[PDB]
Ligand binder design. Structure first.
Ligand SMILES: *CC(=O)N[C@@H](C)c1cccc2ccccc12
Ligand SMILES: *CC(=O)N[C@@H](C)c1cccc2ccccc12
Lengths: 304, 304
């Protein structure tokens, strides 16, 4: 029993982290096979960052200007290319610790683990969600760029995020591993405001199911609702609309607990309208939205 | 910027996890050098667990009754002993992935990372604290016994916890790696109630400092207090007494923020008396007590 904000074991990703230095900028790279992936802004001076022309800046860079260090051993860079907002540094050595992997572009509301790194060395691991406004709420100091977000399916690491930017509001923006930003963000030090950070409704519902499975049941009420009625209340509270697709995804948790999804919606509706009245659910005083239905099943079943 | 409940990177510990089977019970072992450490209750039938005599039960067990599997390879058990509530299985092979390590017995209020494992395979990593009542609030299904808690200092893993028991209230009890339970708990399926789960005051204060460092400042007020005045309020709210030793430990966060520890106590005092009034601090609606002052410094500075 018990339910924790749980990250994937980070070992398979730790084995992929390297240090990338271009001039006086050091950040993190991801070494898979004979390619090191890193933010293209590794090439920028802080002056460059205000209005960088990455193609023009890259012309001044040779393979030997990219210093790649794996532990205390230097890797030889034999090629470099820009793909969207990432650099791909071809090295002469395949990472011997390369796990089975995929690059995936996640949807808002999807959760993943971040391995926060500085100088190619892992400092910590935590669980994130892609926010509906395509930011993440991370923990990233200077030097943490190139840190990655991932999911694991048994032995296959799906890489979904690479850290690029902190917005003036202290929320985070980055790319998939093809170098495409999540959301409208750019690797330029300019006015970039996030949109509404709405609550991931399907995730809250999943977590309420987790609560029931772990004995926290005080919020279960006598009511039901419809998707349309619930959605009127959701909209008023800056919750994402719930779709039949979300209802379908929650079916297994419905089945396990015997609580109809729309009944749990009606419980969530009363929590929104009434508040927590100083009570907690799984040790939280707010409704947690960084567990997916898949996460809740995984943790309640014990997948490895 | 940003502040997350962050675990240590788990790779060094993943390399130590094995499966231990005695009869029809499978749980986790920790393989360091040529010793596999596991809960002694691996030898019990569920009938045994009601009133186990571990010395008597152990007489019926030989080295060959302990099946130890590291990945899909069997380890040869050449000796076994009981130390308090752990078994030490001597194997003929040193773990080639043994990291630098120590066994440490932590104090209440100290935080650590748990690598939740099933069948010797890692499922997830999360951050815990030793509660003042010597329980932890974990995420542990059947099969998770022998999962470990640890801290890392650069490259030395300090092992502080091994999972043994879930109490009827769904909180967790376990041992250090010398097999001594935290608190008054025993590896017997009997009436074991936890004491008062008080809030770790020095940890809340550390986290309020983290909040100020990351721009969450709304709770800072015009007041100060004394340790004695604060402690009157703490006692009323089931917070641990704050000692001068705690004040000394918070000095570096005091220095960095320029907020006197007793001023931050007076802010915490007003939050206890007034509540959050529906506001959040670092995305929490309750005062977080599972960050130590050391954790806050580490994460705000970026140690690897
Ligand atoms: C996130 C990161 O590690 N890289 C960027 C933000 C960075 C770090 C340190 C100095 C510097 C100077 C000029 C531009 C960018 C950076
Ligand atoms: C925690 C754990 O993995 N071991 C214990 C609780 C256990 C698991 C599964 C079956 C069983 C049967 C009898 C006693 C103990 C167990």
């Amino acid at each position: 029993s018990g339910f924790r904000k749980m990250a994937f074991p980070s070992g398979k990703v730790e084995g992929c982290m390297v240090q990338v230095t271009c001039g006086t900028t050091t950040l993190n790279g991801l070494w898979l096979d004979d390619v090191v992936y890193c933010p293209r802004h590794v090439i920028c001076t802080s002056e460059d960052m205000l209005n960088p022309n990455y193609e023009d800046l890259l012309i001044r860079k040779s393979n030997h200007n990219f210093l790649v260090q794996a532990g205390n051993v230097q890797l030889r860079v034999i090629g470099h290319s820009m793909q969207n907002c990432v650099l791909k540094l071809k090295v002469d050595t395949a990472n011997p610790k390369t796990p089975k992997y995929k690059f995936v572009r996640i949807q808002p509301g999807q959760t993943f683990s971040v391995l926060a790194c500085y100088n190619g060395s892992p400092s910590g691991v935590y669980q994130c969600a892609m926010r509906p406004n395509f930011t993440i709420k991370g923990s990233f100091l200077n030097g943490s760029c190139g840190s990655v977000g991932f999911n694991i399916d048994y032995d296959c690491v799906s890489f979904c995020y690479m850290h690029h930017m902190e917005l003036p509001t202290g929320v985070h923006a980055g790319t998939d591993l093809e170098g495409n930003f999540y959301g409208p963000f750019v690797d330029r030090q300019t006015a970039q405001a996030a949109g509404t950070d709405t609550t991931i409704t399907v995730n809250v519902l999943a977590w309420l199911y987790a609560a029931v499975i772990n004995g926290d049941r005080w919020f279960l009420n006598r009511f039901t609702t419809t998707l349309n009625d619930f959605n009127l209340v959701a909209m008023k509270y800056n919750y994402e609309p719930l779709t039949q697709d979300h209802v379908d995804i929650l079916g297994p948790l419905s089945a396990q607990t015997g609580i109809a999804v729309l009944d749990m919606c009606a419980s969530l509706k009363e929590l929104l309208q009434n508040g927590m009245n100083g009570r907690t659910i799984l040790g939280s005083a707010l409704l947690e939205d960084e567990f997916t239905p898949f996460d809740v099943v995984r943790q309640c079943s014990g997948v490895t």
